Amino acid sequence: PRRRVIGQRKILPDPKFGSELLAKFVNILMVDGKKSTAESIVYSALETLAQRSGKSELEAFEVALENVRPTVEVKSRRVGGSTYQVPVEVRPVRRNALAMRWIVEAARKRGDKSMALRLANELSDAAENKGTAVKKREDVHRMAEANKAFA
Amino acid sequence: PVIKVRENEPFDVALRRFKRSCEKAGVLAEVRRREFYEKPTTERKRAKASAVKRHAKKLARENARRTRLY
Amino acid sequence: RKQVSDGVAHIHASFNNTIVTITDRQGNALGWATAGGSGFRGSRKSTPFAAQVAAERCADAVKEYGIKNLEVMVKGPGPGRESTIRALNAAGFRITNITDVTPIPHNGCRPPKKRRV
RNA sequence: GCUUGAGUCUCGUAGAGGGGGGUAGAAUUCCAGGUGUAGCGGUGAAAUGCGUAGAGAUCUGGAGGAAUACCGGUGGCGAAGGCGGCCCCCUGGACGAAGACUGACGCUCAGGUGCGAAAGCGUGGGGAGCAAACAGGAUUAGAUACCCUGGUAGUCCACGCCGUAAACGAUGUCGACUUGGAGGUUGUGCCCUUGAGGCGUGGCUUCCGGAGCUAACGCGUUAAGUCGACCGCCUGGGGAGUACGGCCGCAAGGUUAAAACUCAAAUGAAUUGACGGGGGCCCGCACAAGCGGUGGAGCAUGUGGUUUAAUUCGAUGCAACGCG
């Protein structure tokens, strides 16, 4: 805000295998404070994924997540009153949360028989680089490439 | 101005010495004055206004800014 | 496909556009590249990044000629010159020496009137 | 008569003081040529414009016109307007040193004469750049404006006219006297130049302040202090520096200069607020970062309108509208 820089919230880790990343993912994916429904969707999306790939659950989610990874962002600032968009190098902790947000935004569309089946389609479609979250990442990268004249 | 970068001299050294040459000569100020015609009124008023600002902060430097605040 | 070892780079930087022209030392050019020649239109034409990209395109404009080293002349004010000569050796060159050749009148001709906005 | 005011001469000095004539260098434009090629220019963004008939860039050369970077200065000179490369010719003034010489020759000045920025006018040249008018592109509700691309008179020269400016330190000229400090510029004397010094004395100038003055702001030895001499000018605001007449001018117009009528104020300086598309420093779910809504659908409820015999009354920008 205007003054503070206060310390971060510390959540409890992922129960099935201890990770902060999957606890952040179940917190992002949830709706109206329904933690149990969200973690059921996440688990039935990740155990049903590791047999599509072949590796185990966590690092398959990690290279489904790192393919959608924004290196840079755009921002809007002011120097002449002109107010253009200038690219910025993102911190990785907000890069990772923006990646999870884009994956969930992908999964809310492309409708089929489940939310977990939609996720297990989405993360594999991102992990072989043909999804729509990879389209969001390459559109962010394109909008920063076009605006590289300001740095 | 004229810079000749001789034997045993790196790149950014030479580039900074060229920038030092440009800031010694003041070529960009003398181009920036010659883009638009400032009237002789504006020239004399700029001269007098900058001079009264100059010495009117200078005598404040000399005796007004020498006494303590806290 | 005529060869010559050393030449002169002229980086004419205005406030709207930078033109890099690589000549020989007798003034005869070999090819040029501007800050508007590839993309980079309008407000993005005046930036130093456009001048860096212009130097990078004039670097490949003399791939046939095989230039070993060149002296770099700089004209005009604006966000041209330093980023241009810094990208000039980054695209691979030995800049021999640098001149600032911008025109200064001895009060020769009357400039246009000052803008109101 | 006298030398104290005013002047003359001898010696130097500093100076964009003035008039006439040359000449140099940088740059802009144009023309001719060489290399080379798809953009240039412009803007907040654009477009008009220029460009494949070869531009912009770049080099060699030519031709013109105008102004003189640096020095450059709260520096200098001039009565003011004003005056800025360098050299020469003609020429005005101011200042300093020590003397001499005339001996009140002085100060101010209505009418009069002269000079007097820029714009303008006449005649004859010249014309690079800039540029009223003008055109086109934008911006905009509109934009006969600001911004852009062009562009004519004009700006330049010679000779005449005009005779006005916020021609302003908004401060007439001359003389006398009255605490200080920091500087600048230009002479000059003395002491050991004993060392880039010191102690003096003259002219001009810049700032800050004391008494005093002033409505205050401020001015303050260069007075707006204390006085004297002469001149010009003012008498509420508007009408009005206007009309009519006169004089001047080629004209534009200048100068001189009312009245009827109308208002009870117009003004100056400062003060406390408020305001600013003024400045600086901050704060708030104010914005940003996010999550979820409302506006669309159906119903609930309140209001406005309309209706009605009555649709009781009140709240009705935030701060009324699931409110009393």
* DSSP labels, A64-122: HHSSS--SEEEEE--SSS---EEEEEPPHHHHHHHHHHHHHHHHHSS--S-SHHHHHHH
Token reading at C64: 């046939």
**C1' nearest to CA of B56: which nucleotide?**
D207
Q: Residues C99, B22: contact at Cβ < 8 Å? A: no
The type of residue at A101 is R
Helix axes A92-108, A116-127, angle to 10 degrees: 120
C42: which DSSP letter?
A: G
Distance CA B13, CA C73 (A): 17
Q: Which residues does A116 contact at the CB level (< 8 Å), separation at least 6?
A: A40, A41, A42, A44, A45, A48
Distance CA B28, CA B22 (A): 8
Which residues on adjacent β-strands are paired with residue C13?
C18
Chain C CB contacts of B7 under 8 Å are none
The type of residue at A11 is I
Domain count, chain C: 1
Q: Residues C111, B34: contact at Cβ < 8 Å? A: yes
Resolution, Å (one decimal): 2.9
Distance CA C61, CA C84 (A): 15
Q: H helices within chain C, ranges in order?
A: 48-61, 81-90
What backbone phi and psi angles, to 5 degrees, belong to A125?
-65, -25
Please indicate whether, in this complex, the C-beta atoms of C100 and B34 are within 8 angstroms of each other: no
* Minimal-distance CA residue of chain A relative to C47: A149
**Residue C12 is part of which domain span?**
1-117
- Strands C6-13 and C69-75, how do they pair? parallel
Distance of CA C89 to the CA centre of its chain: 13
Round and report the angstrom distance from CA (A139) to C1' (D104): 102
Give the residue from A69, A66, A73 showing the smallest Cα distance to A127.
Answer: A66
Give the residue from C102, C105, C104 showing the smallest Cα distance to C10.
Answer: C102
B61: which DSSP letter?
A: I
Summary count for chain C: helices (H), strands (E): 2, 5
CA distances for A55 relative to A61, A69, A147, angstroms: 10, 21, 39
CB pairs under 8 A between A and C: 13
Distance CA A122, CA A29 (A): 14
What backbone phi and psi angles, to 5 degrees, belong to C77?
-85, -170
A148 vs C: CB within 8 A: yes
C76: left (phi over 0), alpha (psi -120 to 50) or beta: left
Q: Which nucleotides on strand D sit less than 7 A from a protein beta carbon? A: 25-28, 34-46, 55-60, 65-69, 73-74, 128-132, 146-148, 207, 282-288, 290-292
Distance CA A64, CA A103 (A): 9
Distance spanning both ends of chain B, measured CA to CA: 49
Q: Residues B5, B14: contact at Cβ < 8 Å? A: yes
CA dihedral A111, A112, A114, A118 (to 10 degrees): -70
Q: Which residues does C19 contact at the CB level (< 8 Å), separation at least 6?
A: C10, C11, C12, C32, C33, C34, C35, C54
**Which residue among A82, A84, A149 sits closest to C50, beta carbon to beta carbon?**
A149
Q: Which chains touch C (3 or more CB pairs under 8 A)?
A: A, B
Token reading at A118: 């939609």
Distance CA C79, CA C2 (A): 33
B7 vs C: CB within 8 A: no
Q: How was this structure determined?
A: cryo-EM
- Strands C29-34 and A72-76, how do they pair? unpaired
CA dihedral C27, C87, B25, B52 (to 10 degrees): 140
